Design a protein around this ligand. Sequence first.
Ligand SMILES: Nc1nnc(C(F)(F)S(N)(=O)=O)s1
Ligand SMILES: [Zn+2]
Length: 256
Amino acid sequence: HWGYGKHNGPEHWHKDFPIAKGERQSPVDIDTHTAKYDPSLKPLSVSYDQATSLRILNNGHAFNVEFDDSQDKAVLKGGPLDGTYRLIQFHFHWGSLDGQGSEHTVDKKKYAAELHLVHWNTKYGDFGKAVQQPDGLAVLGIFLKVGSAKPGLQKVVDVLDSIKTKGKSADFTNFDPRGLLPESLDYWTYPGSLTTPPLLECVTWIVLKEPISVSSEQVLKFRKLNFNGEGEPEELMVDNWRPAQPLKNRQIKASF
Ligand SMILES: Nc1nnc(C(F)(F)S(N)(=O)=O)s1
Ligand SMILES: [Zn+2]
């Protein structure tokens, strides 16, 4: 099935998922000189004080930190969004080397990794109905650069050794995602898609301008994870990013 290798990677996905060549695919290159400041944009509201993490899972492509989304505990509102979007999970994309790993690029610059916090529109009642709607999801993306350590990331780094291979999971309660956010909430926003199969065109992307810093040692532990299952030959989980897709005369709007 799909992956990130030469024989099942991004350039192959369109055969099973034709929407890969669609009109609003993600990620994209953010040309900062062409993005336009949008005064219609309301301020962004990230309300994560009640967030309830439950578990972390290696899904064979990345790891997901899962939240309890059976109530309005952690939500994203405002900015370009109408309504309330509830946090369901976050995950990362990262590279084999510090010069690559992000999915979005900024003036063609690639970061070492990208964090995605995935939220769904509560008006659609559940995640699987929301991904079938053009405004069903809101994903907050945050770039990672290598430099000083991110203290709030270390509890994630700490548990990765217990979910090395595909299908492993570990308990991950009481994790606070507020510890992953940069100081500034300035952002770029555009309509796009999931960046993995099934590549559904349901996402309002909100990409923060300010990256967070993580240490070399932290990202190195990311790179010790495995795409394969236990007892199979080691395939390091690296370069699980989709490259930039054609913008197709969407306009990227800036909040600043
Ligand atoms: N892991 C993944 N979880 N969600 C994924 C997505 F494809 F939906 S993304 N990269 O947020 O568009 S990747
Ligand atoms: Zn993602």
